[PDB]
Amino acid sequence: VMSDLEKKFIELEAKLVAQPAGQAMPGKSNIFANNEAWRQEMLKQDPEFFNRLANGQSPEYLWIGCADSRVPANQLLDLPAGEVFVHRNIANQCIHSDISFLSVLQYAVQYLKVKHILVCGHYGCGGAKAALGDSRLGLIDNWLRHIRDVRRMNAKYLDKCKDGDEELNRLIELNVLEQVHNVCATSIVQDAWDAGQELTVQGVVYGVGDGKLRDLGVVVNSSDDISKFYRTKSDSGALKAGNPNAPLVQVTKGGESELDSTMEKLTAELVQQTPGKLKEGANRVFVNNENWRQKMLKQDPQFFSNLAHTQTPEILWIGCADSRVPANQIINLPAGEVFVHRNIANQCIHSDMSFLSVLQYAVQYLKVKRVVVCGHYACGGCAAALGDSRLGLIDNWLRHIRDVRRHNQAELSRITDPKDSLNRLIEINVLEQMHNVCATSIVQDAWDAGQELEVQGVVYGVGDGKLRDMGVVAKANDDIG
Amino acid sequence: VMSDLEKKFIELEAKLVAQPAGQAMPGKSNIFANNEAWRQEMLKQDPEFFNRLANGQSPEYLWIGCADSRVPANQLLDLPAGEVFVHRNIANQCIHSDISFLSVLQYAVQYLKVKHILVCGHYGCGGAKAALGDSRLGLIDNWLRHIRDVRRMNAKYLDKCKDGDEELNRLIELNVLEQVHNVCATSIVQDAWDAGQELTVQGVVYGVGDGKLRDLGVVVNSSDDISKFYRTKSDSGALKAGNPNAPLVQVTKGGESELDSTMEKLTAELVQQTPGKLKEGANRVFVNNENWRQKMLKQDPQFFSNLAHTQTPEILWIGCADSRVPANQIINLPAGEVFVHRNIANQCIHSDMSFLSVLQYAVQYLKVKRVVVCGHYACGGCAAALGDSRLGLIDNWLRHIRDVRRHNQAELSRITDPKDSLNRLIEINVLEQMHNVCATSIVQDAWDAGQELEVQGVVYGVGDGKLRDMGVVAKANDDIG
Ligand SMILES: [Zn+2]
Ligand SMILES: [Zn+2]
Ligand SMILES: [Zn+2]
Numbered sequence: 016v017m018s019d020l021e022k023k024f025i026e027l028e029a030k031l032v033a034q035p036a037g038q039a040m041p042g043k044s045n046i047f048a049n050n051e052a053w054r055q056e057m058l059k060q061d062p063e064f065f066n067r068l069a070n071g072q073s074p075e076y077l078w079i080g081c082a083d084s085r086v087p088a089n090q091l092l093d094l095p096a097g098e099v100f101v102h103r104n105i106a107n108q109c110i111h112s113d114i115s116f117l118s119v120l121q122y123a124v125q126y127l128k129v130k131h132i133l134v135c136g137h138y139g140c141g142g143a144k145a146a147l148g149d150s151r152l153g154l155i156d157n158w159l160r161h162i163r164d165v166r167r168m169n170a171k172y173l174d175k176c177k178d179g180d181e182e183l184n185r186l187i188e189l190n191v192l193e194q195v196h197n198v199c200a201t202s203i204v205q206d207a208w209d210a211g212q213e214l215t216v217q218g219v220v221y222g223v224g225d226g227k228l229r230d231l232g233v234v235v236n237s238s239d240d241i242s243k244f245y246r247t248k249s250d251s252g253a254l255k256a257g258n259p260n261a262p263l264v265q266v267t268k269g270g271e272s273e274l275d276s277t278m279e280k281l282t283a284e285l286v287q288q289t290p291g292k293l294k295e296g297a298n299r300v301f302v303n304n305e306n307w308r309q310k311m312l313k314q315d316p317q318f319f320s321n322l323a324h325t326q327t328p329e330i331l332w333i334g335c336a337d338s339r340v341p342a343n344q345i346i347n348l349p350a351g352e353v354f355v356h357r358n359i360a361n362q363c364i365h366s367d368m369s370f371l372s373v374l375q376y377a378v379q380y381l382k383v384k385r386v387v388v389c390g391h392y393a394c395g396g397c398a399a400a401l402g403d404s405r406l407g408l409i410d411n412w413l414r415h416i417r418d419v420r421r422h423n424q425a426e427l428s429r430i431t432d433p434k435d436s437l438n439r440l441i442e443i444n445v446l447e448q449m450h451n452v453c454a455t456s457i458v459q460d461a462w463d464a465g466q467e468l469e470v471q472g473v474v475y476g477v478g479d480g481k482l483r484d485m486g487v488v489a490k491a492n493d494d495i496g
Numbered sequence: 497v498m499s500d501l502e503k504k505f506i507e508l509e510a511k512l513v514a515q516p517a518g519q520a521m522p523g524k525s526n527i528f529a530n531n532e533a534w535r536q537e538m539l540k541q542d543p544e545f546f547n548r549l550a551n552g553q554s555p556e557y558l559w560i561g562c563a564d565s566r567v568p569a570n571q572l573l574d575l576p577a578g579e580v581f582v583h584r585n586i587a588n589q590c591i592h593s594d595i596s597f598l599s600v601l602q603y604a605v606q607y608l609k610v611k612h613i614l615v616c617g618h619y620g621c622g623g624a625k626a627a628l629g630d631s632r633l634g635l636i637d638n639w640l641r642h643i644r645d646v647r648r649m650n651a652k653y654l655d656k657c658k659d660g661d662e663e664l665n666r667l668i669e670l671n672v673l674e675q676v677h678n679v680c681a682t683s684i685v686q687d688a689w690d691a692g693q694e695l696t697v698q699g700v701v702y703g704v705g706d707g708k709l710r711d712l713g714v715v716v717n718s719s720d721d722i723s724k725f726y727r728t729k730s731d732s733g734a735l736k737a738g739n740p741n742a743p744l745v746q747v748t749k750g751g752e753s754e755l756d757s758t759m760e761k762l763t764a765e766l767v768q769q770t771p772g773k774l775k776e777g778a779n780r781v782f783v784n785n786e787n788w789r790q791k792m793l794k795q796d797p798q799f800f801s802n803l804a805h806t807q808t809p810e811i812l813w814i815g816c817a818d819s820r821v822p823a824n825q826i827i828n829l830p831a832g833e834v835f836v837h838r839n840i841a842n843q844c845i846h847s848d849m850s851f852l853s854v855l856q857y858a859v860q861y862l863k864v865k866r867v868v869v870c871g872h873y874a875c876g877g878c879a880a881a882l883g884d885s886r887l888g889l890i891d892n893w894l895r896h897i898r899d900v901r902r903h904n905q906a907e908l909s910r911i912t913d914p915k916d917s918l919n920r921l922i923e924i925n926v927l928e929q930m931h932n933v934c935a936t937s938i939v940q941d942a943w944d945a946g947q948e949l950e951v952q953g954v955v956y957g958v959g960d961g962k963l964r965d966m967g968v969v970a971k972a973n974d975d976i977g
């Protein structure tokens with residue numbers, strides 16, 4: 016008594032398992048044809064294109080951006096693809112308890128030893144805009160309540176604004192600042208800073224009309240500790256030492272941590288400038304961004320204005336934070352014609368709000384025709400899932416890939432070579448994640464509402480940039496009874 | 497190449513599957529002996545004890561409380577067990593994007609048609625206390641950052657406080673008020689209110705020294721809408737109608753929604769009272785709580801003072817929000833000797849922060865010796881998981897139970913009777929959830945740190961209140977390579 020969705024996937028798994036790990040062939044969709052056209056054009060311009068791509072340097076930057084972004088992170092930074100570790104969600108949020116955010120952060124900081132973290136917002140952000148001008152949005156409204164907290168906490172700055180556009184601009188800027196605060200306040204960044212690890216967190220925004228990054232501030236190292244205001248030196252370390260009953264002694268009245276003060280300063284510097292006309296900072300991030308812009312304007316004086324015209328995306332791409340190729344690029348589409356979600360190991364966990372919010376927004380509101388789950392050969396997140404690391408956020412998130420391994424030993428057992436075996440796990444993970452998006456209330460509602468929505472599974476190796484078909488599902492009822 | 501944990505569970509599954517659905521026998525632990533002693537004493541006092549329990553009325557209250565609570569919700573409300581749908585987490589949080597919270601809320605509101613929602617905090621809350629006086633706590637500090645936002649937003653009220661205790665009292669009260677705000681602001685409560693559904697949200701606190709509920713305010717129906725301040729009537733409904741590009745027009749400068757005003761009023765009423773000495777309201781909740789208290793004092797004048805002395809809990813109990821029996825009761829222990837986490841269908845999702853935060857706090861900080869995952873026969877959450885409902889929060893959360901069904905068809909296929917079939921799924925769900933807690937970085941660290949930690953699986957039918965063994969694991973390495 017399996018549902019049609021269940022049957023469909025058993026069929027897709029057989030189709031996958033009949034091809035060897037890493038050798039799946041491209042499929043039917045025009046995305047494979049477009050991906051091919053791209054590969055050809057790339058090889059034609061530079062025959063070393065993929066060799067260089069497959070052999071780039073580790074990323075030194077973690078970039079937390081928005082899903083509706085018309086410019087790839089590496090591009091804005093004038094850096095090679097893959098040199099920037101990317102996380103994307105609705106309105107570039109850095110919610111305190113969001114594990115999708117926390118796991119990408121911990122992976123970037125502890126696994127990758129990333130040196131700089133950038134939170135980037137963009138003017139005109141559909142997420143920020145929905146928070147102010149739309150209601151009764153369902154699931155995603157719960158995600159957007161965090162942006163509402165930003166408007167709430169900063170009413171003084173917002174009410175000051177002269178018009179709707181100036182107010183949206185300012186909310187977007189304040190949103191970035193608030194997320195920067197959140198990144199610095201995580202246990203991950205606090206621990207790193209306590210251990211003297213070199214790690215900066217900086218905010219940035221830009222308008223697609225010029226692609227110019229404006230500065231929201233950089234924090235180098237600021238303790239967010241306030242226990243010094245409530246615990247006597249003797250009672251200090253109480254809870255960790257098993258004593259949760261040690262008294263709270265008000266050492267000082269209204270103490271604020273170093274982080275609080277740091278943010279107070281950055282806020283002051285943001286607010287004193289005109290909304291939407293912030294200055295660029297002097298850090299290399301801005302100078303590199305500037306060289307990039309000039310280079311673009313050279314080859315095309317309207318480059319950015321066109322970028323600012325691109326039509327609503329018809330595809331949602333869910334990929335891995337490793338990202339050695341921008342989604343729009345791999346399928347030969349203009350920057351901004353694809354809505355993107357990226358996390359560690361391209362997971363589509365059933366109950367993951369970051370994933371569900373992007374899905375709903377794309378499927379229900381933007382009405383995209385396709386949802387593509389894209390994995391990649393040699394994925395470090397997947398490789399990390401098989402290791403022995405005990406990191407509280409990243410390693411509990413990765414336990415989901417372990418379930419995939421465990422439930423697919425029949426096929427995995429046949430492969431003993433480590434490389435191929437990882438690559439097979441990576442393929443089945445894509446298949447399993449596709450199943451999950453197909454099973455969401457979101458896709459099921461769209462389907463039985465008669466909405467055209469294709470869920471495509473894809474995988475590729477950076478050495479060739481060729482997309483390999485993991486399966487496609489046009490419609491499949493998931494009802495059992 | 498399975499890990500020891502994996503082998504261990506294959507062994508536990510065989511042991512379970514050899515007993516018919518609903519007939520598993522009690523196990524070895526003293527908890528089964530204690531549960532039995534309890535059943536006997538109950539039957540001896542009233543032979544209709546379980547018959548009444550098994551046939552109680554559906555809950556009209558949703559109660560969101562804290563995991564370190566020394567008093568069962570139904571007790572404080574002077575109501576029969578099961579008459580209150582309970583959710584418990586660290587510091588009774590109602591985080592905007594917390595799916596564990598959102599799925600219990602939606603189930604209570606849409607499935608159960610609950611009429612009143614109560615957010616209850618308690619003085620001396622270890623979660624609130626840790627937020628002020630302890631740092632470098634790891635995973636859980638990310639959960640606790642939300643309480644820090646409460647201190648941040650309410651600095652004016654807090655700095656006013658004369659001492660540490662008064663300041664903790666006031667933070668706890670403000671925390672409850674902030675969570676009430678969050679409950680009202682959810683898409684779930686906003687939708688219900690828009691549909692004219694009768695649904696109140698009220699805040700309450702109490703100190704275990706008297707068990708007296710104090711009022712934090714009740715909100716009956718307040719729109720949290722602000723799109724009216726930014727969207728012209730024509731542009732209204734833009735995003736839902738597929739147009740995310742409709743302009744944002746600042747209709748009015750600093751508009752606040754009905755909810756904002758409502759909360760401003762409640763805050764004013766809380767703040768003007770002495771921290772820790774709030775008044776009780778006049779609603780039946782308070783009058784019933786009062787009758788309950790007097791009844792307790794009658795049979796025991798020190799009832800509450802003793803309650804306030806109970807030692808740190810030695811067990812973490814993870815149960816279902818249905819809860820027809822308090823955890824401490826079922827295993828014959830004093831109110832407050834068991835740390836409790838409750839969600840829909842007693843889920844222990846790998847990446848669930850609400851679950852992970854309670855786990856870490858109990859295992860790492862309180863150092864509990866046992867973690868018990870308790871499921872129950874005829875569980876409505878599990879039954880709901882097999883239905884066709886498309887609710888954005890509750891139904892995506894339940895997809896996890898669907899995975900259990902799908903991966904255990906070998907055993908499930910043998911059963912055709914709906915009742916037994918559900919009951920078997922419920923059993924395997926407990927086993928699968930135990931596996932998940934065993935596989936967390938938290939339990940693995942404790943184990944290879946040589947810390948005594950037993951993970952017990954248990955299930956029962958309310959018709960007899962007898963705990964049935966689903967398995968126990970004392971230690972099992974989960975490393976593959
Ligand atoms: Zn955006
Ligand atoms: Zn990857
Ligand atoms: Zn507490």
Ligand SMILES: [Zn+2]
Pocket residue numbers: 816817818819840841842872874875876877878
């Ligand atoms: Zn239940």
